[PDB]
Structures are given as structure tokens and as C-alpha cells.
């Protein structure tokens, strides 16, 4: 058991993560085999090299965010004796320069969010086996330094540099003297407002360019943002890309460009990803020279360049778009346009890879949406946010700049084709709003205020959908023929539902639920369900998870009359089942045992329980987890063995347990996983303290006990040598309360 | 001292307060002399013989909500003479209680499970004028049908007001006392009106017959529509002799059609209610509204066909023979566009004053149509879905909206325009093109992300209160909103600034440029920069809500920039500083705020530290609220500071001790802190009137002899007057948790 880091194994190299355990020192106690350590978010105010004597394994150290909420100090050559270190991790440490007399070992090193306003060849020139340099955040909207000093040729030595990132620096001009084995060249935000012709000397090699922010268009930006005067644009010499052939990536992000020299691409036609979000860029949209030099490129994003006071009519997409052959996702968020025509993305049915199409945030009020079937590939068709109506008729290494999550979830996209109108007026559906669209598998519908009710033929026009978001609508699915039409359905999310059409003795109505043959997931969670009118158990041989937090099981099983005590019991093939969140105060031993018998996961926290029938287990031989935190729970059983054989993780933090009872930290072995965290525990009796068969447990949670740290304390500390096999995570965490003098501590450091 | 109520008065006339306060039986401390005892939301189980004895002068009792069924014997209330009202509401009574005073003028009995009405439980009592029995057989499994027995309520003669809503009737009772003026009948699943069910009742002018046939949209209770698509059955004579009407409710009984006859007899009708039906093709014939030259309100929302998405709204010529209407309600019709030519009957209209279009969708609306009106003073076009324009309570009204539309100090201003929660996502150069002249502007929760410089509404230019709540403005340039002189009212609260330039943001320059801007709310605009030269100078503002931003960045500022941002507000009396994260206020801070402050807030922020004798710097302050923070530290010579200060808030605090000598204070509050005790040091001397009001319950108090040089002092100044002397309550010893302090 090392302490107070947690070792694990990760192929052969072993990590320890020693982070964000208040720690004031290196510990001295770090295994002699470990190769990476995590000593990040601690309070260590001094290294030096003592702190790492004889860690020479140690090939990866973290020292970021020492002290957490006066500087670092690290001793000149304290990294010098590790001859296998290899990745220096130092951020956000106030170092107010680069330590001297680091190894040269060193293939990666990140000082960003420090204070280092002195780039020397004495900090980094006998470096020269490094790949990687962040130097990001450093001398950055700082009274004290107007401008990083970069000492002339301080890079030129660094033969074997692939990776330097200057990034959110003040740096005002590209420095020179550059080596030419560089690929990847970070200079966003770094207050440079023209590039010439010879900042990019030698960078033969160069795949990545990234000048983002630089003459900001300032849109919501998490970081500190000032406009070049005149909110002017970014001045880029016509040859300044001339010798850049290899370039794949280039961000132009937020530069304020209003005009794109077509000349810039001409020697680089490989380029497959270019930036050009936030600028200024409609005319440019429609006029596209550029567009010619781009046979390669393969995500272009154009986003938030619209016109401030404009809302045409239609978006002005140049033919010369057709020239984008290689294209493969079109980001063109923030254009805002009133309508989008056939005619209008004529130059985007030719490309044969185009498979996303993202036009969120475009307040668009009407789509001819047949133009989407005359496209070969496409997958994606993003279109959230804008004002569709019923038819009728922070991380500082962030990609700051682009949208860079799914756009819509993967769990759906792998259905097929996707279509998301989420956050648009779709206030109910209207008889032509699926009309002319392709084979649709995968739909969004989220918070339109949509107060359909469901019928079985809204949805006749894409018969195919596998994956239904309808969340936060108001939508009446009590007919027993809502959504039969999609007879594939697969997975139906009907979170937040609230019912505007409640009719005493029909609401809630689940029957539809029968009528699928491939039916797998549905959530009903936060439906507010307190009524159910089904005649008979509701039957699906197919349905595997069912969520039903946020509804009112409480009412329901309350019933004088018992009438809701079997409503799971036909969901034959149900392995999931989540009733958390149903205020549920105590379950009837009748409806506890009419719980689907297939069940292997059982989510109750979050309610109220103040009581648990422990021996109602016995008959769910599948159980394999469940979940009962955040509940009021006192006792305990002392035979769960007796009741269970299949239990393998079980979840009790956040109750009021205050005694383990004999016989607890087994007999259950097949238990593997028990967390016992945030209770009201101040010993860990014996006798719950035994040992048979093989505790199997690998992890025991015990952090956030009011310990009792007597020598009380000695049996389970005794224990816990031991069961080495059996973790205790977080030990740091696992505090005395009492009495005084051992407040604060762990219950490891207190001696026998 | 008056225990355990609260005993007010007004006349001489005396009231007992003595709700929700944890009783088990009537007191017997009752002020002997009171008029009226509220002894609701208690655990009274028992009302008997002898629970009120001494009053004679009782005119009124409240029981509602006991416990939380009643138990209440025979004659129970009869030696009490003077009674004019009884309340017994949700006391889940099994019975009318027999033998109740004759001299009963009126009676509530609402929320029980009372299935039959009994000429014993009622009929001798001949005086009541009002009577409430709605909320009995309801929903309710035991009971199938309420039964009123024959003739129960012909005897009772001097009867105005009956009420039997939400109970199952299906039938109206025969034999009604031809006295009534307002009769209920909501929700009572009676589905057929006869000629004979109202006829002789000559002095009506209230009817209502609601939620008879339900169309269920949003109910708060349950509904259960007739079966078909059936609407209720109102014979065409059913109202013939009904010549007083003034109200006629008929929400939500599913009407197609309505007869006109119904009318043919009703010259006074005031106020008719047709929401939750299914009358567009009413709305676009209505020979109905041929028959009603008198009305003033008419309710037509939520009369939208399920699935269907007109064009345009369809309104009946005959509309034009509203000559008296007021307010037209119409709501939830559901539309595309309106027209100036959809609109023009109700232009004839010469006291039309409200226009309620909410929720109806509409995507377009020719707006100069609103010029062509005589009296127009509300225009509610909230929900819908104009853009940028370029190139619960059981005796509720149910069914109507009820509260003002627009807030009444901005409709005060003139013609009010509300187009909150619509889609104007930025102000186009034509949003408010040939528009009438607005005083009052609602854009709350538009996303609107407009950066204003000073032409956007020049349009409207006198427009007095503006509420631009709830979404994404540019205000930085000093131009912002500058074009609108006359302005009073700006509320800007809950803006998220979507645009932020260091160096720039927050500017609030454009302050400076109104002459008589009044009130400014800055709520919850998480403003933790400001880039003002100079301190802003506003001699008109009176009010500035600052709470929810960073005053604690702010005012941490090394170079202590922000000393003075409010100095230059020279008139200002009322200043909220509430929820910005304060755990001090620099004394240079404080001592610049306006000297000119008689209110000021600094509630649930996390101040652990105050300088009292800065109070110096403000002759005019009568409240300081402290309330919600962390304060332990009390002055002991207030007065030395403050000759001006009447109310002191101080609960919610950490408060353990007061000093010694604790002039201007009328109102001290110190309820919910951590005092064990009042000491004798604490406590001088005479009474004159010094402050009448001091809050301590919810203090953890003390109860050894300590407490008893307090309960002395307590006798010794009647005029001091202590709230929730019940809640006033021990912690110490044993054996005293939680008796009051009385003890
Ligand atoms: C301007 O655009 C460039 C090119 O898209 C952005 O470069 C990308 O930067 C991100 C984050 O710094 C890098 O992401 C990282 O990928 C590594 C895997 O190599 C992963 O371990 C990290 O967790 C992270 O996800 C990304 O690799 C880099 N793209 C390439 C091809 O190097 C850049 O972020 C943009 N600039 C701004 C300021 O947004
Ligand atoms: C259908 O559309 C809705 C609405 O657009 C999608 O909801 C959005 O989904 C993602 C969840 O993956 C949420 O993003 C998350 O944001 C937080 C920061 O606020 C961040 O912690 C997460 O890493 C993630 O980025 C997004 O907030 C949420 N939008 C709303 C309004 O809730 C939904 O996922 C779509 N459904 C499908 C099947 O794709
Ligand atoms: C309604 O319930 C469904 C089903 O429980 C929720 O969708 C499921 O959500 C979880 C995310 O909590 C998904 O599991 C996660 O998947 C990722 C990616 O493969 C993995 O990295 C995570 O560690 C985790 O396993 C699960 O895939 C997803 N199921 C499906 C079919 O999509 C859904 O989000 C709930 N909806 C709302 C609005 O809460
Ligand atoms: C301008 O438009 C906004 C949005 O319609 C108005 O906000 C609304 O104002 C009223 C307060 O007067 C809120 O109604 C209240 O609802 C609560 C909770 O249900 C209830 O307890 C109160 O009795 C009251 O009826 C309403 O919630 C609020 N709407 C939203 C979305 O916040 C605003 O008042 C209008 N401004 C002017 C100057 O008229
Ligand atoms: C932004 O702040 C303004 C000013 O404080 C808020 O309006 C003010 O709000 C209070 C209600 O909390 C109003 O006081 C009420 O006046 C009526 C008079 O009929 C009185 O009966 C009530 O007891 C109460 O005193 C006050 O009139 C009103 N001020 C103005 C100029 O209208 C406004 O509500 C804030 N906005 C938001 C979203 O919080
Ligand atoms: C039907 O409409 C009438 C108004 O015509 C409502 O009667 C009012 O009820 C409220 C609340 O109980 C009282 O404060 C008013 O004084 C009543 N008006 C009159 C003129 O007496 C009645 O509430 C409506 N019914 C329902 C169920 O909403
Ligand atoms: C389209 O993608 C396919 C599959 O990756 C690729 O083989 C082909 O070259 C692409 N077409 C282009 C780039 O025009
Ligand atoms: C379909 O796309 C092709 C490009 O491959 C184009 O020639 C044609 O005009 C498009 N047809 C329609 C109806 O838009
Ligand atoms: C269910 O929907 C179908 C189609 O709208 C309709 O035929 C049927 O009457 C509906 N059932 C109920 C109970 O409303
Ligand atoms: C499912 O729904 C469809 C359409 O309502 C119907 O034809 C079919 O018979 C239903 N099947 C079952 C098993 O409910
Ligand atoms: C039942 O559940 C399993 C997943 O546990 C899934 O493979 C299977 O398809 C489901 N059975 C049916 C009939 O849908
Ligand atoms: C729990 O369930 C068991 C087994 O069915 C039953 O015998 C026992 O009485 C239950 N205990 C309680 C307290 O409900
Ligand atoms: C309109 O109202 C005014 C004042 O309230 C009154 O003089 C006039 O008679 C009303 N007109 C009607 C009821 O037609
Ligand atoms: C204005 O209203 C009058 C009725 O007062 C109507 O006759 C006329 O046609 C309306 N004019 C316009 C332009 O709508
Ligand atoms: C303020 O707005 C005016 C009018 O639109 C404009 O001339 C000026 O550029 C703006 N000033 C600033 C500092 O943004
Ligand atoms: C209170 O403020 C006055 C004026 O700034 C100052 O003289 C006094 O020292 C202050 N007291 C404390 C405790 O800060």
C-alpha cells in the first residue's frame, strides 16, 4: 500500500497519482519503481534535488499547479540526476523564469501560465533533444512585462524541435531564427499584427500555422480580448506562405479578415484544415477566390462571420465552392439568414465527401428541405438553433475557436443519417415536416416547446429513425399509437417532458411501449409522473434500460389500492432500471420483488430511503450493481451474503450509516466494489473485520467519515495491511475528526 | 404582553393573529376583548362547548387547515352571540357541524369531505348571505354524488353568494333562493342547463358554469372531458330570465357553437369568459357578439383547432357591435400573421383599451394597424415570434388571466408595448417603424444581442420605462440608449454581455446622458470591470440595484480604482448591494457611497466585518439592511453615529452578544442569530416611546435565571413590541428545548 499517492499499473510503466492531496512536500515515499508522477494541485513551494533522489526510473513529472491559490522554487540542476526524464510538466507554478541546469534528456516541456517574460539560451539551448515546448500564457495582459524577451537565435540550437507553442505572449513580431525541423507553430493571441515574407524562414517542414486572435473579432471570448485599432484585420503579406508546402493546418480564427489573398494558398495545396471563424468574411463567402486553391481541404469552418445589423434573405454561397473537392465538413455557424433555397447550395451537391453540414445559430425561418437528398455522403445535417416553424404548407490548450464536441451524439450518429432541429419553433409537428428528407436514423427535436400530440403518423415520412431525442417538449404520447410509425425505433429520450394535455384516468397512458420489436433504451426521467392508467403490466421482450428518475414512484406506490406495485414486471428483457430522484422514502417489500428479474443494475439514490429489506436481494441472482446513495439509510444487514451472490459493486455514500455490522466487509465475495464514503462512520469495527473467503474487494471508498483516531483506529489499520489486494483510494482523504490533536490528519500517519 | 397571538387593532376593533403557530387546543390567554381570532394552519384537534368562553364580541373565526380531521361537537359555537363569519376550510370535516348560530352571516366550509347537505346542518341558518361549500365531494372515491336535499336552501332568503364548485352535482339544485346574486357552478360535471334550472332567480349578475365539459389544457387539478367531443348542453331559454347578469363564465365547457338567444335577455352582460373552447368558427361568424353592446371584457383564449396553423386570424365583422368593450382577451388562437385589414371591426371600438395577443406564434405583424385605434393603452404581444425587422389556490380564477399584463408603474407611463419572449434576437432598423407613441417597452428575454448606439429606438423616442431584461445588450458605447431623453425606468437585469473587451467593458458612460432616468437595475449583469475615467455623474437617479455583479473584485483592486463609483450619484436614496460576495467594504468605499442614501442594502453577502461609526456620513439613512452575512461585532454607542437610522436588519448574522446600552431606532431586527442572552448591562430605562419593535426568534437562547433580567424588561416596556413570541425559543437547558421563552 504506498502512500500517499495511489500506484497502478499501466502496461509495464507505473504511475503514481499523487495530485490534488494537499501535499506541501515531494513525498519521500514514492515507490523506487514508479515512472510517472502526477504531483499536480498540491501546496509544494520547494523542490530541490533531494526531492527526486533516487526516483531514476522517473520518466514523466507533473508539477503543475504548485502551490495551488508566492512562487515555485526549484533549485538550479534539481531535475539534472533523472537521466530518464523525459517529460517535464511545470505549468501554472509562478515561475518567474525557466529553471536552470535542466536534463538534456528532456523530449517534452510545458512552462505555460507562468511568469516567464525571458526566453534565454541559458534556460533551453542545451535542450537538444526537445520535441515539444509550451511557453503559452506567460507574458500575457501583465502590467510588469509589455513584451516577452526572446533572446535572438534562442531556438536555432533546438535541431529536433517539432512542437513550439507561443501562444497568449505578447509577443508582437514572429520571432526569428526558427529551426527547420519545426512542424507545428502556435502563435495564437500573441498581439502580432502583420506577417511578413520572412517570419517564416526556413520552416520548410511547417504542417501546422496557427495565428488565431490576433486583431480579435471579440465574441464571447474566455480570456481577456482587445481589438487592433480601428477594429482593423490582421496584415498578412501576400508571399508569407509561399515556402510553406507541407502545411495541413492553418487557424485564422478571430484576425478580423475581410479580404482572403488567394495567393496564400497557392504553394500549399495539401492543406486539409483552415480556420476562418470570427472575421469578417460574407463578401469573401460569396466572392471566394480563394475557393479555387483549396482541391485538398477537408473541414473548412467558417463560422460567426456574419455582418452586425444584417438578416438577408438568403445566404451567398460562391460556385467556386464546387472547386472544394477533397471537403468533408462545412462549419458556417453565425452567417444569420432568413431562408435557405435549393438553389442557394447548388455548389455543395457536387462534392462527392461532403458528410457534415453544420449551419447552427443561423436564426434560419424556413429550409426546402428536399435539397438535402441531392448530396452523395451526407451524415450530418446540424441545424439547431435556428427558427424552423411547424410546416403546414477554462482549459488554457482549449481549441478556443472551433467547435470542436460532436455535434450531435455519437450513441445517434452511428445510427445513420442525422438530423438535428433541437432549438428551433417546431412548436408542434405539422403534417409536411418531414417531407423530401433523406433516410433519416437519427433525429433531434429537443426544446422546440413542442406539444404534439402523438398519433402514429407524425412521423410516417421517415419511417427508419433509430434514435428519437424528443427532450424538453410538452408532448402527449398517452395515445397507445404515439410513435408506432417507427417500428426500427431503437432508443427514445423523453427527459423533461411535461404534459400540457393532463386528462384524470388517462395521463399517464405507456402503452405504445409494447408496440416495438427493437425498443432498447427509453428515458422517462423528470416526466412527473404520478398517475399510470395501463390495464395490464406493460410488456416489451426487448427494452434493456429504462431510466424513470424524477417522477413520483412515492404517489404511485403509496396507492391505497396497491395498484402500481407490478408496473416493471413485464419488461422481461430489463437489465438497467434507474429510480432515482422519486423521493422514495420506503419501497413495499411487493413492489421491491415485482422489479424485473433480468435486472443487473439498480439505481435508487437520491431519494429519501430511511429504510432497506436487505433480504429482498435473494431474488435478483443477475444483480450485479446497485446504487443507493444520497438516501437517509442507518442499518445495515449482517448477512448479506445470505441474500446475494452476484452483487459486485455497491454504492451507500452520502446515507447516515454510523456502524458496520459484523460480518460486512464479508461474506459477500463477489463483491468488488463498496463505497462507504461521506457517513457517519468513526470506527471501522472489528468483526466486520473478518477475512473469508477471499474478500475479493479491490476497492473500499471510506473518505468523509467522522473518524475516531484513538487507538481505536489500530484494528482496521492493521486490516488494511494485511488485504493488500483491497484499495483504499484517496487515504489522504480518509481524515480523523477527534479527537483534536489528531483533527485534519489522515488515519494513516498515526503511529502503533 | 399579548400572548400567544399577535393582537392588532383597527378601530377601536381587535384582531387576533394566531396562525401557524404549532397549537394543539384554543388558548385561553385570548385577549378577552378581541372582534376577530385567525387561528389557521394549526394542530387544533378539538372545538368545544368550552374551547371560546369569554368572548362575547367574537364577529369572526378562522379554523382553516386543522390540523395538519377537526373534531367539533353539537352546538359547539353557540355561546358566542356575535358571530357573523366562520371559516372551517380543509379541517376535513365528515358533517356539517349541527347546531351552528343563527346569527351566521357567512359561512366557508370548503375542502372537506361533506357529501351531504342537510337541512339540519343549514337550513336555520336564515341570516347568511354568503356560502361556500365548493372542494367536498371531489375526485373522491367514498363519495359518487354530493346530495343537496330538497328544498336545503330555499329557507335561507337573505343569501347572495353560493358557491358549490368542484363537487360532483351533474344536476343544478332545485329550489334556489330567488336572492342570489352570484351563483358557482365550476367544475360540477353538470352537463345539461334546463329552462327551469335558473328561471325566477332574478337578482343574478354572476354565473358560472366553467369546467362543465372540459377542454383540458394545464389544468392544476383534475379534468375529465365529456365523453365524445362533447360540449356542455345549454338549453337556448336556459338564461331567459337571468335580465340582471353582469358575469357569465363558461371557460371550458367545450363549446362549438354559441346561441345567441342565450343572450337575447342579458342587456347588462359586463364580463364574458369563453377561453378553453373550440370556437374559432365562432370567432368568425359570432352572431352572438350582436347581442352584447355592453360588454367590457371578452376572454377568447386557448379556442385554437389542434393541429392547424392559419394564415391569419379570422375576426367576425359583428366584433364591430362591441361598443362597450374594454379588453379583448386572445390568447392562444395560434397564427401566422396579422394584418391591417384582420383587424379593422375592432377599430371601430372606441373604449378598447387592452389588446392580449400572447401565445398565438405569430410570426409577422403589420404594426402601424395599431396606430388606427381610438383608446389603445396595452399591447400584449408576448410569446410569439416577430423577429428583426429590415428592409395551489382553490378560490382562484381558474380559467382567466388575472394579473396585470404589464407591470402597472410601466403602464402608468402611457401606451405599453409588450414583445418579450419573441424572437428578436437584434433591433432592426425597422422594428419599431409606425408605431403609436410607446411609453412603456417590454424586449425582456428575446436573446437579444443588439449593440446599441444611441439610434436604435428613435422611432419611439418617448419611451419613459424600459425593460430589456434577460438578454445579451452592448451598452459600452456612451451613446447606448441615449436617443430615448425622457427615460425614467431602464431595468437591464440578468444581461450577459456577449461582446467583452478589456479596457471597455463594463462602460456605463451613457448613464451620465439622461436628465430623468430614475431607476436603474443592473442585477446579475456579473459586472467585475468598469472603464470609466471619471466617477458618472447622474443627478436625476433616485435608485440603483447593483446586486448580483462583483463588487468584491471591485473594490479588492490593487490600485483602488473603484473607490468612488457610486460618489457621483448625487440624488441617489435607495442602493441595493445584495449577493455580490462581500466579506468587507474598504472604509474609503463606504465613506464614498452617496451621502444622499436614506436605504440602503447590503443583505446575503458574506461581510464578517462593519464600521459603524462610518454611519456619520449619512444624515439621511433610516434603513440599513444587514441581513444574511456574517457579522459578530455590534457597536456599543450606536446612537454617537446615527440620529437618522429607524430600521436596523440584522438576522440571518452570527450575533452572540449585545454591548451595553443598546436613540433613532424604531425597528431592530435580530431574529435567527446566535444570542444565548440579554445581560442586565444591556437594558436601561424609560420608556417614552424609544423603538417599538424588536425581532429575536430563531435565537438559541438561554433559559436559566440569566434570561430572567430580560423577561422584567420585557414587562417594563410595553410599548416594545416582540413578533413570533412563540418562535422565541430555548436551547438551553435540557429539558427547556424548544419551549418559548415565556417559560
Ligand atoms: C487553431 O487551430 C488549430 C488546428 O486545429 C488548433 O490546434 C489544435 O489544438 C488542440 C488543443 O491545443 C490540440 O488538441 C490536442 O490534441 C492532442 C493529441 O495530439 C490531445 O492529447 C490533447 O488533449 C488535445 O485534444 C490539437 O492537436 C491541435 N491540432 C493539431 C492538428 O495539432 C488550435 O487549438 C486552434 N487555436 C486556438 C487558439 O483555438
Ligand atoms: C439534441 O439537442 C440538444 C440541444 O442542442 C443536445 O443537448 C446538448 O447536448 C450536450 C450534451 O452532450 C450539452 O453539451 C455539454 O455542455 C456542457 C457545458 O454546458 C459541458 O459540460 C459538456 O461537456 C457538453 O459540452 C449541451 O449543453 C446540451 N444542450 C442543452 C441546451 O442542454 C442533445 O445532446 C442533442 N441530442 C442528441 C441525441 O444529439
Ligand atoms: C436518458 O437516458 C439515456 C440512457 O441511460 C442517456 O443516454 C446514455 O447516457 C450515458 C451518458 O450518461 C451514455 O453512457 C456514456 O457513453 C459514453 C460514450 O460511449 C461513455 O464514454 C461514458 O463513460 C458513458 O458510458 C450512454 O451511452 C447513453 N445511452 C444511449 C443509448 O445514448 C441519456 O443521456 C438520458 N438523457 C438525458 C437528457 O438525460
Ligand atoms: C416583461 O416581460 C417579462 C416576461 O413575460 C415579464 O416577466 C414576468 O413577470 C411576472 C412578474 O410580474 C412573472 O409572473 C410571476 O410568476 C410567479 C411564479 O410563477 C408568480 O408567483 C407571480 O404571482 C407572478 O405571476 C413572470 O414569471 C415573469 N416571466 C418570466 C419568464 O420571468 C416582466 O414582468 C415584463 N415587464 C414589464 C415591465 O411588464
Ligand atoms: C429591477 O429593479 C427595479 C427597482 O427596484 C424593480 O422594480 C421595483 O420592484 C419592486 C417590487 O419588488 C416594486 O415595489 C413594489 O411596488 C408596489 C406598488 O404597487 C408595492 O405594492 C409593493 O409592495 C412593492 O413595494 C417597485 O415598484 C419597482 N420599481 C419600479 C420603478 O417599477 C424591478 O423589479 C427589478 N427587475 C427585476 C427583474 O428584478
Ligand atoms: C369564472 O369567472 C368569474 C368572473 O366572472 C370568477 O369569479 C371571480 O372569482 C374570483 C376568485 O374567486 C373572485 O375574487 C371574484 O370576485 C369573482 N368575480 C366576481 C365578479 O365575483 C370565477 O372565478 C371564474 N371561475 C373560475 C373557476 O375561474
Ligand atoms: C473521398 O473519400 C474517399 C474515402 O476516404 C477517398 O478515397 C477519396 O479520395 C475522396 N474523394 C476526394 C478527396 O475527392
Ligand atoms: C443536384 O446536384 C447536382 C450536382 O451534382 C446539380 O447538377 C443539380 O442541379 C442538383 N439538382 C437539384 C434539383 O438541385
Ligand atoms: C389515437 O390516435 C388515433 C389517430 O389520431 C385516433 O384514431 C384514436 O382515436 C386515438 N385514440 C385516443 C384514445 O385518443
Ligand atoms: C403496433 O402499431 C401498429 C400501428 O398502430 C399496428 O399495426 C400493430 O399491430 C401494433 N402491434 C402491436 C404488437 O401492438
Ligand atoms: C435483450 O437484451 C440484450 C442486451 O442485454 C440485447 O442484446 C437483446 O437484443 C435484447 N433482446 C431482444 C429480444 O431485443
Ligand atoms: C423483508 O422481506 C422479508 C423476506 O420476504 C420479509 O420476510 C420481512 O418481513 C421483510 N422485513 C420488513 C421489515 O419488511
Ligand atoms: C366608454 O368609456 C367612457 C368612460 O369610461 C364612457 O363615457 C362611455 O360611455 C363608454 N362607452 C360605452 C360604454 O359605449
Ligand atoms: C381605420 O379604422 C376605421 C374605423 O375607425 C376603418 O374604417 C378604416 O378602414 C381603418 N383604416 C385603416 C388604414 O386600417
Ligand atoms: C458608438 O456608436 C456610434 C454610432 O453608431 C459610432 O459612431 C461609434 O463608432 C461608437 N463608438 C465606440 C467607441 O464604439
Ligand atoms: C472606521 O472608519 C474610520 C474612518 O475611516 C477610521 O478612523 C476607523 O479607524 C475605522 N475603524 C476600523 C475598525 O476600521
Redesign the interface.
Known sequence: RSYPCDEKKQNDSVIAECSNRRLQEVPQTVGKYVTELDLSDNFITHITNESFQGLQNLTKINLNHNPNVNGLNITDGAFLNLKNLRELLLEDNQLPQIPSGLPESLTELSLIQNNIYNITKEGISRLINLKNLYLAWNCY?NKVCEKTNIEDGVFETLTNLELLSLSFNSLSHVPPKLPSSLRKLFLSNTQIKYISEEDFKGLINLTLLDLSGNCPR????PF????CDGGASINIDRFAFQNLTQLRYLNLSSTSLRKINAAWFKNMPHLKVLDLEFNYLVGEIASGAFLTMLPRLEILDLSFNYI????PQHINISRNFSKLLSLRALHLRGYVFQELREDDFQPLMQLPNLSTINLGIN?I?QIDFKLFQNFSNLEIIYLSEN?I??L?KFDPHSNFYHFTRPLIKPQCAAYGKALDLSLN?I??I??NQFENLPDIACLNLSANSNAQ?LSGTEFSAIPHVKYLDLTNNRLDFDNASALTELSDLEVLDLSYNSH??????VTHHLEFIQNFTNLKVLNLSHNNIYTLTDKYNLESKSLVELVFSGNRLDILWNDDDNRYISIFKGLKNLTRLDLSLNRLKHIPNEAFLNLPASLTELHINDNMLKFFNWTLLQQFPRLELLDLRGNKLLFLTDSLSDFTSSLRTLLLSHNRISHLPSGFLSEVSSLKHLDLSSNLLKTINKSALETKTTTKLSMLELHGNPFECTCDIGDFRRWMDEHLNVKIPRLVDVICASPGDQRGKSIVSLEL
Open positions: 495582459f471579440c465574441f464571447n471570448a481577456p480580448c482587445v481589438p452586425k445589423g444584417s438578416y436564426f425561418k427558427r416553424s411547424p403546414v419553433s412548436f408542434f405539422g403534417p400530440v400540457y394535455f393532463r386528462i384524470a384516468g
